């Protein structure tokens, strides 16, 4: 996250850290005790799918304070329409091997109904994006969880103020001062409405972190609600990676 602030411990309780062989891979969003939403492109180069770990309740990566909960990833589900190395349909649904325990520091973000998200949440201007990604373009990653308030653009206005499909949206700033960054992909774009927070986007990827004249590109979660809900009702299948038909 570029140009944000530290998310005070416990104020981003749905944030997930994904690790491969102990190393930072990507962010994610808890939506229930066993389900995490992330970005498909995080898994393009995974060789050993059994070394993937999800961590909840994380804040400061330099220390262990006892609020962290680590789980193995039992399933990674990606839409059939996603092409590795690209931006369109950049979403993944992860099933944890065992549920996390909800606590003051571990709480799911609400996955909204599609109608609610399209009719109402889509017109809330500002939303929060978070992660342990790079603090600058070509810079070191953050040790404490960072958060940034970003304004959403209509796709017409993104193109004017700057391809971008109906499965994406633009949010953030074009002046290069504030943006999501490499290391934040898969993390939440969370939107507040009448006292409750909802998942509206996933940090995807564009042509560069904090690039002047360009906005952050986010997966438009509202297009995937029905797809996600059906998968969450389904039984697990052998083999971690699952490609599921979209729509």
């Amino acid at each position: 996250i570029v140009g944000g602030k530290v998310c005070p411990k416990g104020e981003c309780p749905w944030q997930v850290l994904l690790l491969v062989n102990g190393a930072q891979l990507c962010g994610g969003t808890l939506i229930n005790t066993i389900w995490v939403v992330s970005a498909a492109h995080c898994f393009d180069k995974i060789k050993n799918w059994r070394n993937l770990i999800a961590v909840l309740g994380e804040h400061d990566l330099s220390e262990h304070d006892g609020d962290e909960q680590s789980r193995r990833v039992a399933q990674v589900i990606i839409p059939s329409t996603y092409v590795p190395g690209t931006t369109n349909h950049d979403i993944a649904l992860l099933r944890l091997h065992q549920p996390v325990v909800l606590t003051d520091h571990v709480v799911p973000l609400c996955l909204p109904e599609r109608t609610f998200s399209e009719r109402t949440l889509a017109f809330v201007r500002f939303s929060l994006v978070s992660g342990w990604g790079q603090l600058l373009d070509r810079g070191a990653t953050a040790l404490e969880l960072m958060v940034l308030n970003v304004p959403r653009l209509m796709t017409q206005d993104c193109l004017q103020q700057s391809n971008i499909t109906e499965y994406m949206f633009c949010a953030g700033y074009s002046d290069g001062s504030k943006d999501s960054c490499k290391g934040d992909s898969g993390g939440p774009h969370a939107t507040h409405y009448r006292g409750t927070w909802y998942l509206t986007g996933i940090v995807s990827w564009g042509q560069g972190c904090a690039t002047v004249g360009h906005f952050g590109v986010y997966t438009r979660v509202s297009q995937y609600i029905e797809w996600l809900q059906k998968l969450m009702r389904s039984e697990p299948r052998p083999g971690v990676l699952l490609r599921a038909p979209f729509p």
């Binding site: 416990g10 104020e11 309780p13 939506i31 229930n32 909800l102 606590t103 003051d104 520091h105 709480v107 799911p108 973000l109 609400c110 996955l111 909204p112 109904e113 109608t115 609610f116 009719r119 109402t120 409405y193 009448r194 006292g195 409750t196 927070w197 909802y198």
Partner: protein, 57 residues
């Protein structure tokens, strides 16, 4: 009705045949008698931040 002002609902909204509307709440919440408000039914409902909820409790 639901397209304007979220139909007055705090959370989810469904249109019905006629001048009819029904609000609904996410799992872990229940709908109040006003027909629009949602109140938690569990300790850790989705989309709420415990340390901030207890800070105003």
């Amino acid at each position: 009705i639901c397209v304007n002002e979220n139909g007055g609902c705090e959370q989810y909204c469904s249109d019905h045949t006629g001048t009819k509307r029904s609000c609904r709440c996410h799992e872990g919440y229940s709908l109040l008698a006003d027909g629009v408000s949602c109140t938690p039914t569990v300790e850790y409902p989705c989309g709420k931040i415990p340390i901030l909820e207890k800070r105003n409790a």
